[PDB]
Amino acid sequence: SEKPYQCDFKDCERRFSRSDHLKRHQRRHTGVKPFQCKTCQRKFSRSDHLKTHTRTHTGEKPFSCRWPSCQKKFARSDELVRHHNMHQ
DNA sequence: AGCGTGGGCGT
DNA sequence: TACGCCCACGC
Ligand SMILES: [Zn+2]
Ligand SMILES: [Zn+2]
Ligand SMILES: [Zn+2]
């Protein structure tokens, strides 16, 4: 409920609860990409986004569709959420 | 459909 | 701070 870390970049009103969350957000302004994929050498701003990117090189799809006669696999949870909502 | 990526909130 | 997971938007 309290977010004292405010971004003072031009025309930005973002506020955050912790210093790292501010630093993470500020990477969208600066374009800094500290993390690099060891397979394709592409650089990314965040490590968690790098992790899911690597699954494009391995084909790993940990999230499976729970419909018995389907069972499509997906790399990220949000891909499975959209798929499950589609079966409706 | 597949995925970059910005944000919420956690350990 | 490191590290991560989920959710959602926009290609
Ligand atoms: Zn900002
Ligand atoms: Zn890569
Ligand atoms: Zn399915």
Q: Which nucleotide is nearest to A15 (CA to C1')?
A: B7
Report how far residue A85's alpha carbon sits from residue A69's, in angstroms, rounded to the nearest whole number. Answer: 16
Angle at A61 between CA A33 and CA A66, to 5 degrees: 135
- Three-class DSSP labels, chain A: CCCCEECCCCCCCCEECCHHHHHHHHHHHHCCCCEECCCCCCEECCHHHHHHHHHHHHCCCCEECCCCCCCCEECCHHHHHHHHHHCC
| A55 and A61 Cβ atoms separated by less than 8 Å | yes
Q: What method did the depositors use to determine the structure? A: X-ray
Report how far residue A9's alpha carbon sits from residue A18's, in angstroms, rounded to the nearest whole number. Answer: 17
Q: Which residues, in sequence order, are bridge partners of residue A62?
A: none
**At what resolution in Å was this solved?**
2.3
Determine the distance from the C-alpha atom of residue A88 to the mean position of all C-alpha atoms in its chain, rounded to a whole number: 26
Q: Which nucleotide is nearest to A77 (CA to C1')?
A: C6
Could you check: is the Cβ of residue A47 within 7 Å of any atom of nucleic acid strand C?
A: yes
Report how far residue A40's alpha carbon sits from residue A12's, in angstroms, rounded to the nearest whole number. Answer: 33
Domains and CATH numbers, chain A: 1-88 (3.30.160.60)
